[PDB]
Structures are given as C-alpha cells and as structure tokens.
Amino acid sequence: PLKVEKFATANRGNGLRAVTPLRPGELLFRSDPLAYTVCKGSRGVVCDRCLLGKEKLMRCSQCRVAKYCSAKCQKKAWPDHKRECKCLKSCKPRYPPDSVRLLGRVVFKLMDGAPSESEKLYSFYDLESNINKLTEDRKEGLRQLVMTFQHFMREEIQDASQLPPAFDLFEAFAKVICNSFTICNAEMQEVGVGLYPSISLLNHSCDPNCSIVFNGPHLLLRAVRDIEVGEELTICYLDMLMTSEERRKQLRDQYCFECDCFRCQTQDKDADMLTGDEQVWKEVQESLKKIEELKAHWKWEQVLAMCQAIISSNSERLPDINIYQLKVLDCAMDACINLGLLEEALFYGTRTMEPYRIFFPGSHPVRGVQVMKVGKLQLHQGMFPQAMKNLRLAFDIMRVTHGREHSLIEDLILLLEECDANIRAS
C-alpha cells in the first residue's frame, strides 16, 4: 500500500508522483540505506553503525578504522563491515575517499546480501549516471576513483567475477555522484553518506513539496505541502542558504541539469541573502571554507575562535540575514552548545531565528531543529515563556517534517511537557 509511484517524466528522467492527494506531514516512504558509511570528518567521532557521537568508542580489532559505541552496534554492522574490514586493513596507512568506501559497501551488499528493501521502487542498477553530460574533467576524476577502488578492494575483489553481472565501476561511481544522500544526525550535522535507490527517484526543486529526514541511517520521506493526484514529488538536493547562482553551479557540477524552477527564474531571495558590503561577505565566505572544514571534524574550539573573529570583528560587520554571516552564527551556536557556553549559544541562536524564518519557508526540518535548539537553550536557562513559544513552534514544524516515526519528536514532547509544568507552577 503505497501513496507514490514511479513514472517517466517529460523532461527529467524518472520521477515519483502522488497516487492520491497528500497532506503536510504524511509519511510517504521510509528506507534503510542500500549502503552507507560515516563521513571523513566524523570517522572515529561517531559510531560507524548508529552515527551517534558517543564519548567512548571502541575500534574494530582487525582494521581499527571502524569505531562502535557498543557490542550491539558492532554486531549489527558486522555483515556490512566484514569484507571492507580486510580492505581497510590492507591499506593500513591510507584511508579511501568516502565515495570509494561507499561503493565497496554497495558491491558487497549486492554480491553477498539478500535483495534490499531500499531498492523496492528503483535499484542501484536503475540509477541515473548522466554520463553523456559529464565534462571530461569529471570523467577524469571518475577514472581516478575507479583505480582507487581497484586498489582499495584488491584484497577482496580481484576481477569481474567478484562484481555483480556486468557491473561497471565507472558507471557505478557516476551514479554515486548524483545519487548520494548526506546523512544528518538529530542535530542536523552531516555525519554520513548513503544510497537509498528508491528515494533517488525524487527529482529536485528549490521549492520542494517533500522533505527527507534521517533518524540514524534510517530515512523518512514526508510531504511538507499539499500535493494533488498525479503531482510530481520533489525534494531540495541543496542547502537552503544558497543564492540562485550558487545553486546553478552545484546543480550543474554535481547533477548535470539546469534548474528551471520559479525561484531560480526570479532569483528569489538572492538580494536579501547578499546584503551588506560585498568585500566583507566575500572574506566571510572565504573564511567559512575553513570554519566548515573544522566543524566537519568536530573541532569546536577552533570553530568558535574563527566565528568570534567574524561576529565580533573590530572591522566592518554584516547583517544577520546575509547568508554567510548566518552560517557563521549557526556554526558559532553549535560550537558553543558543544563547549557548554550556553549563554553565548543562545545569543547567536536567537540572532538566527528571523533569518531562518525567511530562508526556510514552510515546514523545513533544519528550521524545526534550529528552533528546538533555541527553545532548549531557553528552557535550561529558565526562560519558560520564551522556551515554550519556541518549543511549540518547533513542534508545529517537526510534526510535519519529522513525525511520530522520528525519535526526536518524542524528545520534543518531553521538553514541551517539562516546560509547561514549569509555566503551570505559579
């Protein structure tokens, strides 16, 4: 009993469309990955299986590349890990690119695993590769990835008989480029990458009618707007804090298409995103490169230092609605939360609220979680009426974007009940 179906679109390959009208919040599909792996910066910081950042992680005794929070996670991961383990070990000093480790797990899954429910609607076989649109620059990078895969996997895979029938590594990597999902933890931090072939039927819109959220490696696909019968289902492949020009470059470079949506035609929100003096936000955009690199490696004290140099610069400053200033405020907030600097975190967090309202319209999981963070900071600091407003706002959003099937809704409900009990006591 599904409310969605595969169909051949007029000009964007295959897509997913509603078989019946859908309401905001409706669960449309849920999937474990065909294959997934922790990303580089989070390796050794989060559990390889559940992708949570425990304080204590045990590394696998053979390879010592995979780390686990528990015996339970080590066992649930052993089928997925058992053959890559010998490869990671054979290349003891070197570590492969995420894409290479991912495709290794794909190969082992397809060779050794039962048919995956993640492929119910659409299989890895079926995925778009866009090879006839790749630049020769891109094709050259794919060729290098193929040779990297051949090197990394030589201990377990020496020839084609150990690959699925007529499995082509070049085409496989081309598929990974435009069908990889960035797995986010409950705090919306990027922690892993995975393939969800059924979900890969969703085409892109900068104004989508559906949204995905992750609960560990588990993916929930939900409607975030009313959707009519026969209407194509879309998600936004990209970060919302991007101008139309930046979205153009990514959708070209990674997904090989020219976005024609109404937002890109109208340059919707571009002007407000780039307010302030250009030479200032050019420098911030450059600094953000290393800030996000540091954040990807959970380097919070260094993240905070770079952000303070910007937020409290002795030189000219930017409005908080400037998307680069906004990104800096958000990184500083997360840094302060992880360093226990809760007053400072709330200062930065509250500054992001109105910009997030503008740039994450409707029901977007990123805004829901941001508002929940702010409400939780306020609750801990005894600002109950303010916390309650933000916690209910987060619930308004996340009952649509997350739903009862996501464990964070249970946590939010408990915060609401705690905050309400404090307000009632008077």
Ligand X SMILES: C[S@@+](CC[C@H](N)C(=O)[O-])C[C@H]1O[C@@H](n2cnc3c(N)ncnc32)[C@H](O)[C@@H]1O
**Residues at the interface with ligand E45 (CB under 6 A):** 79-80, 82, 105, 108-109, 112-113
Choices 66-74, 113-121, 162-170, 366-374 (CB under 5 A): range interacting with Zn ion = 66-74
To the nearest 10°, the Cα dihedral for 383, 388, 389, 393? 130
| Closest separation in Å from C-beta 301 to ligand E45 | 37
* Closer CB to ligand E45, 107 or 336, in the complex: 107
Task: Please choose which of ligand E45, Zn ion, ligand X, none residue 204 contacts, taking the beta carbon within 5 to 8 angstroms, the exact cut-off set by kind.
Answer: ligand X
User: What is the rounded CA–CA span in Å between residue 192 and residue 50?
Assistant: 10
- Range 21-60, binding Zn ion (CB under 5 A): 47, 49-50, 60
Residue whose CB is nearest to ligand X in the complex, by number = 13
User: What is the rounded CA–CA span in Å between residue 343 and residue 381?
Assistant: 8
H/E stretch holding 183 reads strand 181-184
* Closer CB to ligand X, 198 or 378, in the complex: 198
Told to check if 347 binds ligand X by CB under 6 A, we report no
* Closer CB to ligand E45, 38 or 318, in the complex: 38
* Closer CB to ligand E45, 37 or 234, in the complex: 37
| Closest separation in Å from C-beta 170 to ligand X | 16
Going by C-alpha positions, the residue among 412, 408, 352, 360 that lies closest to residue 387 is 412
The answer to whether residues 46 and 184 touch, using CB atoms and an 8 Å cutoff, is: no
Told to check if 221 binds ligand X by CB under 6 A, we report no
Told to check if 91 binds Zn ion by CB under 5 A, we report no
Applying CB under 5 A, among 16, 223, 259, 409 the residue interacting with Zn ion is 259
Query: Exposed, middle or buried by CB within 10 Å (0-12, 13-18, 19+), for 268?
Result: middle
| Closest separation in Å from C-beta 193 to Zn ion | 17
Residue type, 272: D
User: What is the rounded CA–CA span in Å between residue 222 and residue 238?
Assistant: 17
H/E stretch holding 37 reads strand 35-38
| Closest separation in Å from C-beta 94 to Zn ion | 15
Told to check if 13 binds ligand X by CB under 6 A, we report yes
Backbone angles phi, psi at 350, to 5 degrees: -60, -30
382 annotated to a ligand binding site: no
Give first-to-last CA distance, the chain, whole Å. 50
Query: Exposed, middle or buried by CB within 10 Å (0-12, 13-18, 19+), for 202?
Result: buried
Task: Please choose which of ligand E45, ligand X, Zn ion, none residue 264 contacts, taking the beta carbon within 5 to 8 angstroms, the exact cut-off set by kind.
Answer: Zn ion
Choices 8-16, 29-37, 59-67, 156-164 (CB under 6 A): range interacting with ligand X = 8-16
* Closer CB to Zn ion, 62 or 162, in the complex: 62
- Range 191-220, binding ligand X (CB under 6 A): 200-201, 203-204
Please list the residues that pair with 211 across neighbouring strands: 222
User: What is the rounded CA–CA span in Å between residue 373 and residue 54?
Assistant: 19
Told to check if 118 binds ligand X by CB under 6 A, we report no
Task: Please choose which of Zn ion, ligand X, ligand E45, none residue 79 contacts, taking the beta carbon within 5 to 8 angstroms, the exact cut-off set by kind.
Answer: ligand E45
Please list the residues that pair with 212 across neighbouring strands: 221
Going by C-alpha positions, the residue among 179, 200, 195 that lies closest to residue 121 is 200
Query: Exposed, middle or buried by CB within 10 Å (0-12, 13-18, 19+), for 73?
Result: buried
81 annotated to a ligand binding site: yes
Applying CB under 5 A, among 261, 309, 342, 353 the residue interacting with Zn ion is 261
The answer to whether residues 391 and 375 touch, using CB atoms and an 8 Å cutoff, is: yes
Per CB under 6 A, residues contacting ligand X are 12-15, 127-128, 130, 178-179, 200-201, 203-204, 255-257, 259
Q: Which residues bind Zn ion (CB under 5 A)?
A: 47, 49-50, 60, 62-63, 66, 69, 73, 85, 206, 259, 261, 264
Q: Residues within the annotated binding site? A: 12-14, 47, 50, 60, 63, 69, 73, 81, 85, 122, 130, 179, 203-204, 237, 257
